Amino acid sequence: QTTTVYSLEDLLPYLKQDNVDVKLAPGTYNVNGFDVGEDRLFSTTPLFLFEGSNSTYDFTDVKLNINTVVLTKFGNNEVNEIQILGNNNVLKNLKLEDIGTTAPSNRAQSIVIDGRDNRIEGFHLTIRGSYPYGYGDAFGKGGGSVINHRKHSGVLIRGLRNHLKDCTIISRSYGHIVAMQAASYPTVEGCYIEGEMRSTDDMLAEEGTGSPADKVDFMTVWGYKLPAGYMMSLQEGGIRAYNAGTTYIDGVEIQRATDNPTVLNCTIKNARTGVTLAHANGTKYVEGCTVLGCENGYSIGSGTVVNCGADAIYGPVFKNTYGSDKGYNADITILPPSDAYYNGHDAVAYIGGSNHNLTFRSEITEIPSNLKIMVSGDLQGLRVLHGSNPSQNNFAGTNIVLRNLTNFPVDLHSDSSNITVTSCDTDNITDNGTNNSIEAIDC
């Protein structure tokens, strides 16, 4: 039997109860600064704390507008709009929009999924309000920042067997769009994930304005002045696994890495990365995805990427994260450009590590001269110049199968060895490595 409520005030009591079936009636509901306080509706954060288990919540035709000023009403603390702590809950069809662009007093998360066996389905989320907004991570995304930040991220999947399905997540905020943290068997399925871009040249045009970047003479956290010629996302990862983190299940606090992530039939647009799971453990499986205009396509470290696609307008479609990457099996289509090329990385793929099986397919005939498949070598990546992030660049590749069903040139560096290469044409293959095999295939 479904209980229908017609106010946020009447909804909140159900979030503390088990085994309920609740529907918030179709309509527009607004949360403003005046709704936060001791005798106001929201006296604590997280605003919507789903503590019960085995419950279902129907938000069909519900527009929930949350004024970004609310992110400053809880002191110097984290503000989570929605957090699920219970188990076996289903939340469906909510349209949640941050109103305005006010930055959090500290930081914010739109949705946090702890517990186990929860599902959020059919949500439409628009994320706003963060600082600094306009630079990506150039001036710091963690500690020791050049410009101190007030990040605001989208969906954080933790817990066990938690599931995000058929959601639209649009970010205009400096933070991750979808991320996994201490999550065991998280699944992201059928989602559309979208940020927006800004060139480093446009940022550099702030010279002499007195902007925050102008004040630090554009000195990045990578140890050098912000280079021209790159296209950056104003968001962080599209789908990204955290290195560490904490989750809560049945009152147990758990610190662990993410393990066994699955990503299916997702479209990720204009984020710092399409799908990055290198920090996760266990079985990694990514299938049927489409990455458009991201700074990086797929970087899962190890596992399977299959029937996936990405364009190469702003960065490579594929990157091995470390030289210890092992067993990365990928079948990636290099898609037609979704916009004008602006790729300062000078690469469509950077390959290293050992025992990979990599296939690239494309119908592109006009190859920009700076674009190439690199096995080993010195990647001109925005964040790995001049010794920055040194473990993520200049590493060897050994015992790799590379099936190049593209017109893209291939550059095998001297650090490359035992690379088995097949390609449509071999004339545009430069081999400076050891015991590499290069063979021509017809089309």
Numbering used by the authors: 1 to 443
Give sentences from the paper.
FdlA from Flavobacterium sp. SA-0082 is an endo-type fucoidan-degrading enzyme that cleaves the sulfated fuco-glucuronomannan (SFGM) through a lytic mechanism. We show that the FdlA-NTD adopts a right-handed parallel β-helix fold, and possesses a substrate binding site composed of a long groove and a unique alkaline pocket. Our structural, biochemical, and enzymological analyses strongly suggest that FdlA-NTD utilizes catalytic residues different from other β-helix polysaccharide lyases, potentially representing a novel polysaccharide lyase family. Here, we report crystal structures and enzymological characterization of wild type (WT) and eight single mutants of the catalytic N-terminal domain (NTD) of FdlA, revealing its unique substrate binding pocket and identifying the key catalytic residues.
We first measured the enzymatic activity of 12 mutants and found that eight of them (D137A, K141A, H176A, F179A, E236A, R240A, Y242A, and Y242F) almost completely abolished their activities, H279A mutant retained approximately 65% of the activity compared with WT, while mutations of Asn243, Arg272, and Tyr322 to Ala only negligibly affect their activities. However, we identified changes around the potential active site in several inactive mutants, implying the potential roles of these residues in catalysis. Similar to R240A, the mutant form F179A also exhibited a structural rearrangement around the active site, with a 3.8 Å shift of the Tyr242 side chain towards Ala179. Therefore, mutation of Phe179 and His176 possibly results in the dysfunction of Tyr242 and hence loss of the catalytic activity of FdlA-NTD. As it constitutes the catalytic acid, the hydroxyl group of the Tyr242 side chain is essential for the enzymatic activity, and its improper positioning may severely affect the catalysis of the enzyme. Circular dichroism (CD) spectra showed that all inactive mutants possess similar secondary structures to the wild-type protein, indicating that the loss of activity of these mutants is due to the residue mutations, but not protein conformational changes.
